[PDB]
Amino acid sequence: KVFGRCELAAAMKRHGLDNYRGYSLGNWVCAAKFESNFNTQATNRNTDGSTDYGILQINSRWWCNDGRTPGSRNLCNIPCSALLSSDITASVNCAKKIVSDGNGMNAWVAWRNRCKGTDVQAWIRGCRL
């Protein structure tokens, strides 16, 4: 599915990502925009042979099992393909685990480079929430 901005913000809020570990909702919407263009089906292969998956481009080296990244972990205990659903449940639950592990949202390159230190509340402006 390709989400609307306010459509995504409302789902993410329902899933408890507003202010999770300090991160207001706009941070998660911005990160999704720039990682996946709001597309749940987006996949991208990396130079090490892992693959990024889903609306938040969660990587197979450590977080999911895609059966094709050798020497990898599956710390969220899910097939990587679950991160491609239009239900964003598997992505949000595994993003919570990711954000909790030490670097916060710095774990996402596009958030660090494109959302950190910007007015991220603009990403939810004028949304019924």
Verify binding: residue 59, Na ion, rule CB under 5 A: no
Using CB under 5 A as the binding criterion, the count of chain residues that bind Na ion stands at 5
Verify binding: residue 81, Na ion, rule CB under 5 A: no
74 binds, among Na ion, Cl ion, none (CB under 5 to 8 A by kind): Na ion
Q: Is 52 a catalytic residue?
A: yes
Q: Is 119 a catalytic residue?
A: no
Selection from 87, 105, 126, 85 nearest residue 35 by Cα = 105
Question: How far apart (Å, rounded) are the C-alpha atoms in residues 86 and 60?
Answer: 19
User: Considering the complex, what minimum distance in angstroms separates the CB of residue 112 from Cl ion?
Assistant: 12
Encoded tokens for 6: 């306010």
User: Considering the complex, what minimum distance in angstroms separates the CB of residue 3 from Na ion?
Assistant: 25
Q: Is residue 48 part of an annotated ligand binding site?
A: no
| Phi, psi for residue 84 in degrees, rounded to 5 | -105, 0
Q: Which amino acid is at 2?
A: V
Helical residues (DSSP H) of 15-108, grouped into ranges:
25-36, 89-100
Considering 7, 35, 87, 119, which one is annotated as catalytic?
35
Binding residues for Cl ion (CB under 5 A): 24-26, 42, 69, 72, 104, 121
Which residues belong to the annotated binding site for substrate? 101
